[PDB]
């Protein structure tokens, strides 16, 4: 992090307590999901991290594969942004990442943080086996409990700005047990269909 005294800027290493608190706030959110993004967005604001700090934070929160995909995307976003013009970037003063580690280069650091943040958008979709696809209703699970069970896994797994209602509707079916799955040819029809698949199983005697 880069410290801002009340009365020059200086870098200080991450404190494990702060990293730990970030991971606990991210909770079960997958990289790119809303909770994940709000968390690391708040962290970048609070700690004004350098490029090196951001690399430590990445490896603490995400798997080694995810970290590599992030690096690939971030490199492309960097190249593209260089053409448009990066504030504080002297192409003759060495690699941009080295420059972003100079705590005096605030503008350049703030730009790098924003590209670092934006890079997470491309990460989902490269995960073809999310956990929310696995959540499946057992022969014993109630239906009303299962629909919420899927809602949270989608809340934690789906990237930002992605439809969830059309996902849960199919998932509340494709991932339901064969027990209650037989009430799904006369499925009720409403405006928000979700209210129906529950009406069908609003009362389900085992």
Author numbering: 1 to 7, 9 to 207
Question: How do the authors describe this structure?
Answer:
Human T-cell Leukaemia Virus type 1 (HTLV-1) is an untreatable retrovirus that causes lethal malignancies and degenerative inflammatory conditions. Here, we show that high-resolution crystal structures of the mature-length HTLV-1c CA protein define essential lattice interfaces and identify a distinct ligand-binding pocket. Across the known Orthoretrovirinae, CA is a two-domain protein with HIV being the best characterised. However, our structures reveal that HTLV-1 does still have a pocket formed between helices 3, 4, and 5, albeit an electropositive one capable of binding to either phosphate or sulfate in vitro.
